[PDB]
Each structure stands twice: as C-alpha cells, then as structure tokens.
mmCIF file of C-alpha atoms and ligand atoms in Angstrom:
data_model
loop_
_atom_site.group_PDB
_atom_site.id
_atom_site.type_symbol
_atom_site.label_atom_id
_atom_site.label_comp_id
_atom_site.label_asym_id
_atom_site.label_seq_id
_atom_site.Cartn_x
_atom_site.Cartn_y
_atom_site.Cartn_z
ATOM 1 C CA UNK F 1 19.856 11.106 3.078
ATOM 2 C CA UNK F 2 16.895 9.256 0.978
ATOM 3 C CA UNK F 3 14.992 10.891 -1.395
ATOM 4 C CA UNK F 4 11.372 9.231 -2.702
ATOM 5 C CA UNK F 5 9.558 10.378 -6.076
ATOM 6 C CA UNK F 6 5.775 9.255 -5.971
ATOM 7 C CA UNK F 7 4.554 8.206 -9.552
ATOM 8 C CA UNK F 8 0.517 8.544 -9.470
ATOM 9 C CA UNK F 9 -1.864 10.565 -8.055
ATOM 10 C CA UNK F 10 -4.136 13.299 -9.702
ATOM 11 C CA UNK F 11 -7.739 13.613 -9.487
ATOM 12 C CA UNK F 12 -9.744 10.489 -9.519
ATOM 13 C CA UNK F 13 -12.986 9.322 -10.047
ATOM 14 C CA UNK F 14 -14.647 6.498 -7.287
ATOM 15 C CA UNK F 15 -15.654 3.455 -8.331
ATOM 16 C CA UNK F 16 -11.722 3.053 -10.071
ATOM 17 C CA UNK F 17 -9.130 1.848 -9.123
ATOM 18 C CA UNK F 18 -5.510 2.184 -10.092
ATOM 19 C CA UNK F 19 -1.914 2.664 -8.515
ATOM 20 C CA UNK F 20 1.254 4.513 -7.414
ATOM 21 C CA UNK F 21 4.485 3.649 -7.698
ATOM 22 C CA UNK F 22 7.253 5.471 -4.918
ATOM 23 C CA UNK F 23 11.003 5.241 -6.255
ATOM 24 C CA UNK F 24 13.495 5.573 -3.500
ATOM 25 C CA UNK F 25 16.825 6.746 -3.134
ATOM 26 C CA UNK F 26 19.787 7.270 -1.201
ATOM 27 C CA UNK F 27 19.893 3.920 0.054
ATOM 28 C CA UNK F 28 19.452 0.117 -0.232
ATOM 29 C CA UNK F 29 16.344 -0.793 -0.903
ATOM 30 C CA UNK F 30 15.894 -4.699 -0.289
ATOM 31 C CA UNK F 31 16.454 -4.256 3.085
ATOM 32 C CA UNK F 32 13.921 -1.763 5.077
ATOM 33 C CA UNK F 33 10.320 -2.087 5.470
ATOM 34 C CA UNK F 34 7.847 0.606 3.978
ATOM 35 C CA UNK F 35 4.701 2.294 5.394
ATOM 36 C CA UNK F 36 2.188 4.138 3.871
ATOM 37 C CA UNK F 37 0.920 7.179 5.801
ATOM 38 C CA UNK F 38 -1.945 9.269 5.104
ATOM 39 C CA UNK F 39 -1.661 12.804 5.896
ATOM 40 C CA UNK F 40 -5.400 14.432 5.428
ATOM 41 C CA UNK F 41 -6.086 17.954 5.120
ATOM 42 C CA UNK F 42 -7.192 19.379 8.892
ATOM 43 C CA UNK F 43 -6.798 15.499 10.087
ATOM 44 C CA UNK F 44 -3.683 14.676 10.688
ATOM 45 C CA UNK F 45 -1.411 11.459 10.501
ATOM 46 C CA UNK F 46 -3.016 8.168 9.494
ATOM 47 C CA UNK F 47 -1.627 4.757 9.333
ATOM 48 C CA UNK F 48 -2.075 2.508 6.116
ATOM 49 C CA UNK F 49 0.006 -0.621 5.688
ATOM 50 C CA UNK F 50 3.498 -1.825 5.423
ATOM 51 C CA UNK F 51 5.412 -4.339 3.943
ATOM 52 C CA UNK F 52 8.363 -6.471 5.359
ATOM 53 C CA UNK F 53 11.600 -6.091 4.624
ATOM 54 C CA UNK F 54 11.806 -8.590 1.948
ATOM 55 C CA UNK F 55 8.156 -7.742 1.411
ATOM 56 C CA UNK F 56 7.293 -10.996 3.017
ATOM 57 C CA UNK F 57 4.897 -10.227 5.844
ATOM 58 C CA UNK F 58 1.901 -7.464 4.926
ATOM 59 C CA UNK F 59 -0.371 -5.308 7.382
ATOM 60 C CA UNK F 60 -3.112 -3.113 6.152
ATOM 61 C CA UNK F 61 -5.073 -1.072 7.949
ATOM 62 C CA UNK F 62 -8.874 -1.572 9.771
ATOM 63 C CA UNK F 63 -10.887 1.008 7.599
ATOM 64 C CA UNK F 64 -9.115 0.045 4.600
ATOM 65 C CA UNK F 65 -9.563 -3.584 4.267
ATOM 66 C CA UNK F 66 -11.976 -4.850 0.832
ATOM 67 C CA UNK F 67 -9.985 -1.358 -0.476
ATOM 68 C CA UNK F 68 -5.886 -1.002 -0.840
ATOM 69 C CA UNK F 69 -3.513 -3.902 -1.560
ATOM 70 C CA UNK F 70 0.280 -2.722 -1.626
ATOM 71 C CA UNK F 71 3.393 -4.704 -3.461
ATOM 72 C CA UNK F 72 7.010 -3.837 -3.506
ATOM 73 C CA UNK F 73 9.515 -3.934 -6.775
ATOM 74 C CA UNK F 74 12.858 -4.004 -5.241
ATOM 75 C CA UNK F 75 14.581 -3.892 -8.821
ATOM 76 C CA UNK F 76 13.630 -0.357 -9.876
ATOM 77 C CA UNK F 77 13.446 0.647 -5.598
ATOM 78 C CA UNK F 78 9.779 1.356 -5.387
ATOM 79 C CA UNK F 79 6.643 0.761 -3.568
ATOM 80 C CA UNK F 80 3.089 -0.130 -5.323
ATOM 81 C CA UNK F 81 -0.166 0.934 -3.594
ATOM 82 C CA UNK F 82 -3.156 -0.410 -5.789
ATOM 83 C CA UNK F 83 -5.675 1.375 -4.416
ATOM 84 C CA UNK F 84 -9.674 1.093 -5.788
ATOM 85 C CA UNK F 85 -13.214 1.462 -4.929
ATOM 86 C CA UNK F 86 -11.564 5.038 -3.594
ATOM 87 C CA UNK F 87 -14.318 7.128 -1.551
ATOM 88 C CA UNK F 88 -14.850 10.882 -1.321
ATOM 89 C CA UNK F 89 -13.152 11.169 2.225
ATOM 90 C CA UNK F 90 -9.853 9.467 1.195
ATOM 91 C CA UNK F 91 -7.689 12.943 -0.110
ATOM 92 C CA UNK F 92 -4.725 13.126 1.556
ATOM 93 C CA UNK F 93 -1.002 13.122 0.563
ATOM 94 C CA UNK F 94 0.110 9.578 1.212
ATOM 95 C CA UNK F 95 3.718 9.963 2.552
ATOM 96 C CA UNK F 96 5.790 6.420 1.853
ATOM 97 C CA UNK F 97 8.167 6.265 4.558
ATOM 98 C CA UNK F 98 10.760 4.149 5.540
ATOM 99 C CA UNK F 99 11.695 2.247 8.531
ATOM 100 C CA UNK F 100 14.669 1.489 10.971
ATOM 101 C CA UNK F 101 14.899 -2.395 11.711
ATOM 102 C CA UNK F 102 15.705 -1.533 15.708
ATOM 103 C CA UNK F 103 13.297 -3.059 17.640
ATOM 104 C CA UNK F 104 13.139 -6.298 18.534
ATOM 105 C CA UNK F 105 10.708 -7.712 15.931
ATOM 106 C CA UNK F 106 10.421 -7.335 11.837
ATOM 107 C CA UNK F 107 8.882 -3.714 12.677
ATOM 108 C CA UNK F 108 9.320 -0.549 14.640
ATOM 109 C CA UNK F 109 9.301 3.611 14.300
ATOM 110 C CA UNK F 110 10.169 5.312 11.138
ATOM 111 C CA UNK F 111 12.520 7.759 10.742
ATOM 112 C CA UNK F 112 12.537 8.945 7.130
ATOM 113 C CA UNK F 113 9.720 10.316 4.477
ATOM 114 C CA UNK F 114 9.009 10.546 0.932
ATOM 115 C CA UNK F 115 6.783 13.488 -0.418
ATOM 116 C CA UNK F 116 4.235 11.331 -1.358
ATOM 117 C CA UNK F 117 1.203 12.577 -4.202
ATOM 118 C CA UNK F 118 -2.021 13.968 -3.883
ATOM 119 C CA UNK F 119 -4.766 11.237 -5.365
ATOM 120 C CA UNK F 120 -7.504 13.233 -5.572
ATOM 121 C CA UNK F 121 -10.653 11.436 -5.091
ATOM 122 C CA UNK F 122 -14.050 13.148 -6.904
ATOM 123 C CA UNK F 123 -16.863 12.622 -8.967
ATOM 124 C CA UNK F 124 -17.570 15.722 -11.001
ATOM 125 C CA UNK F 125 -15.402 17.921 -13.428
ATOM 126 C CA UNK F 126 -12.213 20.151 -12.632
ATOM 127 C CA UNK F 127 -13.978 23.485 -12.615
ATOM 128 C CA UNK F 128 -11.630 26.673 -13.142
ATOM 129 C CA UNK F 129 -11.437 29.572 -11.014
ATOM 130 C CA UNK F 130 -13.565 32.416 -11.749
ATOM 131 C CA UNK F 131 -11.610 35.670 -10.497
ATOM 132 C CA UNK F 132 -13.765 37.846 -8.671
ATOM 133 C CA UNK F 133 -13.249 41.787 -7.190
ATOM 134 C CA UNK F 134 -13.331 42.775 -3.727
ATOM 135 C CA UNK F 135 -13.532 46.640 -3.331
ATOM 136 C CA UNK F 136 -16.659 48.129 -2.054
ATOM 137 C CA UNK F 137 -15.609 51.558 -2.765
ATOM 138 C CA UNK F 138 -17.897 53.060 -0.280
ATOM 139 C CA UNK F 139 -17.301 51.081 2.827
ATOM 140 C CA UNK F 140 -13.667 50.986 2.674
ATOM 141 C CA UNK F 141 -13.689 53.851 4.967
ATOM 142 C CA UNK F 142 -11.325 52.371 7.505
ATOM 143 C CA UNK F 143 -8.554 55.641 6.947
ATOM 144 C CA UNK F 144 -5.083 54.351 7.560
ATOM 145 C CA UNK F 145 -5.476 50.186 6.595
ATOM 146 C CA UNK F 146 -8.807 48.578 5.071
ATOM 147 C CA UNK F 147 -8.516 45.363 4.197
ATOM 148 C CA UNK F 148 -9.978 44.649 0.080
ATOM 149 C CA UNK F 149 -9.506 41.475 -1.707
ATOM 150 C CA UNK F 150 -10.196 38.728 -4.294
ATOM 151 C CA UNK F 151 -12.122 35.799 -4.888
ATOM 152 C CA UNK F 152 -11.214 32.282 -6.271
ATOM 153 C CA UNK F 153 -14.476 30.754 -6.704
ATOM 154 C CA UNK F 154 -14.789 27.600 -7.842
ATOM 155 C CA UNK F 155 -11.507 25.524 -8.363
ATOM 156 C CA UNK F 156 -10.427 22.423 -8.319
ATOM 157 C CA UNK F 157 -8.057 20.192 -7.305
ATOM 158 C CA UNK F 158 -6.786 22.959 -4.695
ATOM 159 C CA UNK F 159 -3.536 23.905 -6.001
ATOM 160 C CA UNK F 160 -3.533 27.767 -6.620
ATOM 161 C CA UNK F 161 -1.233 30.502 -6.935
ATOM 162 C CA UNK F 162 -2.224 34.439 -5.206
ATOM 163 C CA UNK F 163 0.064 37.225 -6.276
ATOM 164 C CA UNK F 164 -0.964 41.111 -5.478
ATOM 165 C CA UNK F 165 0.163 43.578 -8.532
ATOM 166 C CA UNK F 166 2.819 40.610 -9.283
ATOM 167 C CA UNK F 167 3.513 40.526 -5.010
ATOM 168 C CA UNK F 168 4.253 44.267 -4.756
ATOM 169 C CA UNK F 169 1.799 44.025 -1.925
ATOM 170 C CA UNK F 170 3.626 41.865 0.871
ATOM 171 C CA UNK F 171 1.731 42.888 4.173
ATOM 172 C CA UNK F 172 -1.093 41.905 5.327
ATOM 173 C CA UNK F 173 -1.339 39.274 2.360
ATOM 174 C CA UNK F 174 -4.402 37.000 3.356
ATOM 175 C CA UNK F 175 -4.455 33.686 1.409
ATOM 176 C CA UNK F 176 -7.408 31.911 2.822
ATOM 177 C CA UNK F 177 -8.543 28.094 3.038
ATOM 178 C CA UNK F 178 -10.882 26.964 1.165
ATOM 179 C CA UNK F 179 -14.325 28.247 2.013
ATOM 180 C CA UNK F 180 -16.521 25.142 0.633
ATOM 181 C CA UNK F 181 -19.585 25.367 -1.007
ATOM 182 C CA UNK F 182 -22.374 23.185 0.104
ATOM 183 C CA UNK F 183 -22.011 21.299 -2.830
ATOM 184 C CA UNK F 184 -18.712 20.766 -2.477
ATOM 185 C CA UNK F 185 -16.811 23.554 -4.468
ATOM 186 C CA UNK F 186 -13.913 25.297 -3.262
ATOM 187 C CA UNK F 187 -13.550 28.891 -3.454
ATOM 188 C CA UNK F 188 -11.395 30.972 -1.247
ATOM 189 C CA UNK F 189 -10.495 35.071 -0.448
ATOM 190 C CA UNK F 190 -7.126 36.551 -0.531
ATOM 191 C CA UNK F 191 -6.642 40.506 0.344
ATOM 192 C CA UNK F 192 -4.428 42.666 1.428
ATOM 193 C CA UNK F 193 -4.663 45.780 3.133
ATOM 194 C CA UNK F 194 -4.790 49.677 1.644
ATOM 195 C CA UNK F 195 -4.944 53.218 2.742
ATOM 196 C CA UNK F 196 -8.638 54.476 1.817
ATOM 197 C CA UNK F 197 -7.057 57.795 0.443
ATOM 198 C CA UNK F 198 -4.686 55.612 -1.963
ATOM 199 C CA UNK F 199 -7.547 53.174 -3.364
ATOM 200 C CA UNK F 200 -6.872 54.168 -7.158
ATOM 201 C CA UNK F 201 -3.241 54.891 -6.769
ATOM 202 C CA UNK F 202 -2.106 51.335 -7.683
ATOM 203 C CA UNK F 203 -5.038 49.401 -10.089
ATOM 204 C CA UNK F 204 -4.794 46.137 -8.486
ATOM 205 C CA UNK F 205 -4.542 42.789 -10.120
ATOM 206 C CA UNK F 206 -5.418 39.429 -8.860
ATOM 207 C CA UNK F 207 -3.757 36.539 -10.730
ATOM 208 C CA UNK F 208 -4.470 33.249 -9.910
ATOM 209 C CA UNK F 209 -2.854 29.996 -11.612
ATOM 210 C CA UNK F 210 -4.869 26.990 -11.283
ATOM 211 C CA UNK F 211 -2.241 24.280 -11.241
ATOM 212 C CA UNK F 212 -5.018 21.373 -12.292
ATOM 213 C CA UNK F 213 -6.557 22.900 -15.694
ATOM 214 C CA UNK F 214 -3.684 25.840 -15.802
ATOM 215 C CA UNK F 215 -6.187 28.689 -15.516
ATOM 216 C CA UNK F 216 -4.570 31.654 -16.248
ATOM 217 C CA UNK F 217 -7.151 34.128 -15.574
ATOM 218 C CA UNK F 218 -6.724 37.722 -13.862
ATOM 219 C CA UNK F 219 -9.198 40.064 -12.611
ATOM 220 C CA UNK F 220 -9.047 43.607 -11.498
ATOM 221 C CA UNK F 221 -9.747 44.708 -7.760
ATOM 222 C CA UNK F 222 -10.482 48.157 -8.386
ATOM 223 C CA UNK F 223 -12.892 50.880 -6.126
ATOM 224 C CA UNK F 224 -16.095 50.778 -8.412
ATOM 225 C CA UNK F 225 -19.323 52.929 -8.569
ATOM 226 C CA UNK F 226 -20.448 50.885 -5.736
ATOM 227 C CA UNK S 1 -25.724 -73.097 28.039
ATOM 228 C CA UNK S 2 -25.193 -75.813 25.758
ATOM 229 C CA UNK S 3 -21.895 -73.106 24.435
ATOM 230 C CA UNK S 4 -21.235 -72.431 28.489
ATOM 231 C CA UNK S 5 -20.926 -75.817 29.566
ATOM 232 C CA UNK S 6 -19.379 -76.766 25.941
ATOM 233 C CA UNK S 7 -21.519 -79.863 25.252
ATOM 234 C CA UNK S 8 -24.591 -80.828 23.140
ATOM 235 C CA UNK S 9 -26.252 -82.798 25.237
ATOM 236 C CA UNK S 10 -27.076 -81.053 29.114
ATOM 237 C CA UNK S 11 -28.441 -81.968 32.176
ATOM 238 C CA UNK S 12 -31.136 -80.787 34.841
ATOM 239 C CA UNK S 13 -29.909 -78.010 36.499
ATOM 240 C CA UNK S 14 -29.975 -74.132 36.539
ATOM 241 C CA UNK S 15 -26.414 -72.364 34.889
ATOM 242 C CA UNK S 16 -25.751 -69.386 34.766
ATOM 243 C CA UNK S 17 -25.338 -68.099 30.664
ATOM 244 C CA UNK S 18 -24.555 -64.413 30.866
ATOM 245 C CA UNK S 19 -25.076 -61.300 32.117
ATOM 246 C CA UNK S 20 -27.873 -59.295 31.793
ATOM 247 C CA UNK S 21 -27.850 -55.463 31.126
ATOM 248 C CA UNK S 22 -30.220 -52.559 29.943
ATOM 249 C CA UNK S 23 -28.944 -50.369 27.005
ATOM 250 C CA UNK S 24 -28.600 -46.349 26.605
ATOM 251 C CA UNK S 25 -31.599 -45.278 25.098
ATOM 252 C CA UNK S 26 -30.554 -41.676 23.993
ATOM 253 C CA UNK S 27 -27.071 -39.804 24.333
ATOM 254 C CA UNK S 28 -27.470 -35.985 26.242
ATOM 255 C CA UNK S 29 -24.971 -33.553 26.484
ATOM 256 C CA UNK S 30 -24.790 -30.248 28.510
ATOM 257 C CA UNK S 31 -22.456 -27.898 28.241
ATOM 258 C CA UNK S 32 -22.590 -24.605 30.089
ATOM 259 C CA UNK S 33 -23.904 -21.442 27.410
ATOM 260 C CA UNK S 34 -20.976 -19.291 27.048
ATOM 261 C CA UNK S 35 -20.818 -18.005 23.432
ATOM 262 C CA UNK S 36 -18.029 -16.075 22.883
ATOM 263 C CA UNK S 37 -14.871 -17.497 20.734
ATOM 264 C CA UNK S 38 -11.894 -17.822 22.324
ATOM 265 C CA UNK S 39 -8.783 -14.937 21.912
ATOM 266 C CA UNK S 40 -6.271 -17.152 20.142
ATOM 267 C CA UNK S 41 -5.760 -14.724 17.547
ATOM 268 C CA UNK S 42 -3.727 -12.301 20.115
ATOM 269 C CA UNK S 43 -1.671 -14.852 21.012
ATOM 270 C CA UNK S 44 -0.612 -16.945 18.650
ATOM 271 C CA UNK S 45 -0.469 -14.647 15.877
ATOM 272 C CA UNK S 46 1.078 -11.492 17.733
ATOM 273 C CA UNK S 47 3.855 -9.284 16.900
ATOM 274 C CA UNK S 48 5.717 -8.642 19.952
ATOM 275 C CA UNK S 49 6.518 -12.458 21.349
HETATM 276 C C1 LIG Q 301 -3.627 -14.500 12.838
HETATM 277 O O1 LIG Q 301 -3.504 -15.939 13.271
HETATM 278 C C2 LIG Q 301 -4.611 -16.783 12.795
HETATM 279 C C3 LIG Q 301 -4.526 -18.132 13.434
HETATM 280 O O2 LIG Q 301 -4.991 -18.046 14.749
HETATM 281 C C4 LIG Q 301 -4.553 -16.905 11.272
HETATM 282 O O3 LIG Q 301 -5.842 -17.298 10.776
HETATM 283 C C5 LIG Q 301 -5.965 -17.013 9.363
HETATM 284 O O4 LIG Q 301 -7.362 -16.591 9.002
HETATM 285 C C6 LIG Q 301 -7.466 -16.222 7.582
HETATM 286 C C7 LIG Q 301 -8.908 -16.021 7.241
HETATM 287 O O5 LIG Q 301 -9.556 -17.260 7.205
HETATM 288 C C8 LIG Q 301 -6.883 -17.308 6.676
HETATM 289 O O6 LIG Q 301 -5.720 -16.792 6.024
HETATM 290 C C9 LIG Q 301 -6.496 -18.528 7.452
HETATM 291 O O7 LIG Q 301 -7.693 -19.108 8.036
HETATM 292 C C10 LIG Q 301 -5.529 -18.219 8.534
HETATM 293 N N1 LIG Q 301 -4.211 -17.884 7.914
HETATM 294 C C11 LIG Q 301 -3.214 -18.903 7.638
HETATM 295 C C12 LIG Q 301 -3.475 -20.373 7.971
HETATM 296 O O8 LIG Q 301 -2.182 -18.591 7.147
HETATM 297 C C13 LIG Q 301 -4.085 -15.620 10.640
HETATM 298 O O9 LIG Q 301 -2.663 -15.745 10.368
HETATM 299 C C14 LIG Q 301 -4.292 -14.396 11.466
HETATM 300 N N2 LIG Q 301 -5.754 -14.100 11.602
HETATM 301 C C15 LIG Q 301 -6.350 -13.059 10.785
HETATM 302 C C16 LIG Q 301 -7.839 -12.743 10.910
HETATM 303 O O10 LIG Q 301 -5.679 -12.452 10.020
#
C-alpha cells in the first residue's frame, strides 16, 4: 500500500543536467532499497541503479556510467536521480520502485512501483499542434461506415487529448501513435467512422489539448468542395 | 695467506686462500606470453557469496 510522487521531469535540453526527487509513502522508508527502472516507449523495461538499504552500497547501470549518479534523503522519504549529459534516446518514464529484502544478500526482486515522470530529452522548441481536416468528400463513398478523421501535426512533448463532437462519436474512435516526421516531429491521425449519406448531418469537431504548451485549438472535419 | 695462516711473516709453501668463482653477467627472465588479466573482480567482489 505505497504510494510514490516523482518531483522532476519535463522536457529537457542535452548537454544539462539536473534531478528528480521520488517521495514515498505508505511505509518506512530507511529500510528498503530503491531501483530506478526505465520504461521506454515501444522498448520495454530497463534497469538503472539502486541504492542499499541504508543507501550504503550503489549499482548503476553499463550504458549509463560517465551519465546518472543517484542519492537517497531518508528524512523527507525520497530518492534523487541527478541525471546529465542526457541524450536524445533516453525518454522514458523512470518508475522508482521498491524492494523486498528476501533473498539472501542486500538485494533481490521488487514488488512495488511508483509512477515515475516523463524527462523529456530534446533539443528544439515545444511546437503546438496544428489541427488539420480529414474528409475527402468525394471518396468517402464507402455507403454504410467510411472511416474520416483528423490530424495533430506537429506536437510536442506527446501528451494530447482527442475528443469527437465532445466524444459523441464512441465507435470506431482511432487515436493513433505518433507518425514521426523525419525530422523528428510528431504528428498523429484520429477518426472515426460515418455513414456517407449522413456526412453533413453532425459538423464535426476535432479538439485537441496539448498538455505541454496547453494548445487549445479546434478544427472542423467537414465534407468540402473536394 | 698472510690473513689465512694469521701471521706476518710466512713460509715456502703453496696454501690455499679462497675460492674462486665467475660472476652473473646479465639477469634473463622468461615468462610464458599470456596477456589477459586475471578474473578477480567476479570473485572477490560478487554479490551472491
Ligand atoms: C569490485 O572489486 C574490486 C577489487 O577487486 C574493486 O576495485 C575498485 O576499482 C575502482 C576503480 O579503480 C576503485 O574504486 C578501487 O581501485 C577499487 N575500489 C575500492 C578499493 O574500494 C571494486 O570494489 C570493484 N571493481 C570495480 C571496477 O568496480
């Protein structure tokens, strides 16, 4: 029954360095070792560090060493990662996790997890989303469902919010991953599906909230002269 | 001889002084050419013991 608030995190530049800070509760601290453990987008789980018990003994991992150093302040029940020099391939949310002291040695499996933050690693300006149509209006001609859409171009950090005429649409919603551009932007389409005969029935509204810069911005999806 | 037989004055005769004995010019070693270090890290300093 532990719960673990992450301090940090946000988009960051590379070449800097700074910190988090993981307050824990629901238990006593001074007496369980911490991990740190990556979880990348489309990777999977990836080991980091961890520090004793008392904090006396610390591991870090084999790609990360000249990178990460990690501390614990038992006082306030947190966990320090001072991370720097961060790269572009190091976005991930870093769960902090603690241990049970089972096994037969001063480490062994962990059991719970904090929802660590999302240190977003960059070199370029959080770009808003630009809200784009989908509706051909000519080759929509699918009778019963056709699937039309809008686009996100261009946002970052990837939080983002797709509601259809404020949700009224609720099958066949299709919120896509990001589809990157080659220089690195994301962008992504999210449609739903409508009878050809009831294209102007319903004016449909895409409404996107870009969590980074709070873009705001709605666009119409709408069967056009095209 | 005159330290040997512990006098100053000595007599006709051959003695016998010391010993003669022919001294290391140079100091060789050869060792056989294995290279790599040895794996003490994964034993002394292991987790599991
Ligand atoms: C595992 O054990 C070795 C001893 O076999 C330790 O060697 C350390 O190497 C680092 C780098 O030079 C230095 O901290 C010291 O030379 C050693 N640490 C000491 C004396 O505390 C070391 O504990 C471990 N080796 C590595 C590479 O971490």
């Amino acid at each position: 029954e532990v719960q673990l608030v992450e301090s940090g995190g946000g988009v960051v530049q590379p070449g800097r360095s700074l910190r988090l800070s993981c307050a824990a509760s629901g238990f006593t601290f001074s007496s369980y070792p911490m991990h740190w453990v990556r979880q990348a987008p489309g990777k999977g789980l990836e080991w980091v560090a961890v520090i004793s018990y008392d904090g006396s003994n610390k591991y870090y991992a084999d790609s990360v060493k000249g990178r990460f150093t990690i501390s614990r302040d038992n006082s306030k029940n947190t966990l320090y990662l001072q991370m720097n020099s961060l790269r572009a391939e190091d976005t991930a949310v870093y769960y902090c996790a603690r241990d049970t002291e089972d096994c037969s040695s001063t480490t062994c499996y962990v059991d719970y997890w904090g929802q660590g933050t999302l240190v977003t690693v960059s070199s370029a300006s959080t770009k808003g989303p630009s809200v784009f149509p989908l509706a051909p209006s000519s080759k929509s001609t699918s009778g019963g469902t056709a699937a039309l859409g809008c686009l996100v171009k261009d946002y970052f950090p990837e939080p983002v919010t797709v509601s259809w005429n404020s949700g009224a649409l609720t099958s066949g919603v299709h919120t896509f991953p990001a589809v990157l551009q080659s220089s690195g932007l994301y962008s992504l389409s999210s449609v739903v599906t409508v009878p050809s005969s009831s294209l102007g029935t319903q004016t449909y509204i895409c409404n996107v909230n870009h969590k980074p810069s709070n873009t705001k911005v709605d666009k119409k999806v709408e069967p056009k002269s095209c | 001889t005159k330290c040997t037989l512990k006098s100053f004055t000595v007599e006709k005769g051959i003695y016998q002084t010391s010993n003669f004995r022919v001294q290391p010019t140079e100091s060789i070693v050869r060792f056989p050419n294995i290279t790599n270090l040895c794996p003490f890290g994964e034993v002394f300093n292991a987790t599991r013991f």
